[PDB]
Amino acid sequence: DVCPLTLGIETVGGVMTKLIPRNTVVPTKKSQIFSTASDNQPTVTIKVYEGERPLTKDNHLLGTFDLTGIPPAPRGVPQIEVTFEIDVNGILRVTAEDKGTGNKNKITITNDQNRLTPEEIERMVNDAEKFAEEDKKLKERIDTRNELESYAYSLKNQIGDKEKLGGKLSSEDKETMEKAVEEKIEWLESHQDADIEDFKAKKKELEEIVQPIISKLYGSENLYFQGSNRLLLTG
């Protein structure tokens, strides 16, 4: 037996993130490490969805649960492992664990809880075929946006981290780059609608300030700063 629909969770931006792909045989176990969407975020909300659309508003909610007691850390560093366990019966168990503290939380979802009619399931597949290219383009834009944000958040963290980049750095380099990533982050908050080229343009701008600095803090001109690309969850 296989999964009728792709299973996953909602990430920042109402974004569907795949955990169990459609037509995956049961039983199966699949996991992915996520992180916080906010600085000093003590809680992450896990929302479970089924569907083939890039935005969770077009998919179907199966359930939700919280993971609390997360130690104060910058955005993107808490290690939240989310696991999807399906057994033969169709029982879905979703777990969220902090890899640092070992604090878990779980939800058990039975196939009868919020069961979709076969007409609903087909309509969801028909929609994913009908909007296949529009959803293909939206996904690539979302991936480009999240990459720029990962790159922006990682920098702001490293600039503050004395054990790594912040230690090697100096002023005016520290003030130059902090102001620069702050200006890009402020832009992002009011430009989630932006097209692929605008996201791509804003990064190349941030890089032409970061790279000349990185190139001389360390020896090579072949060293580039890159973000964790960790997907984020709201709380």
* Resolution number, Å: 2.6
Q: Report the distance separating Cα 61 and Cα 217, nearest Å.
A: 48
Gap between the Cα atoms of 85 and 152, Å rounded: 33
Q: Taking a C-beta distance cutoff of 8 angstroms, is the pair 65, 105 a contact?
A: yes
If one counts every other C-beta atom within 10 angstroms of the C-beta of residue 26, the result is 15
SS3 132: helix
User: Residue 82: exposed, middle, or buried by beta-carbon count in 10 A (0-12, 13-18, 19+)?
Assistant: buried
Pick the closest to residue 47 from 114, 102, 125 (CA basis): 114
From which experimental method does this structure derive? X-ray
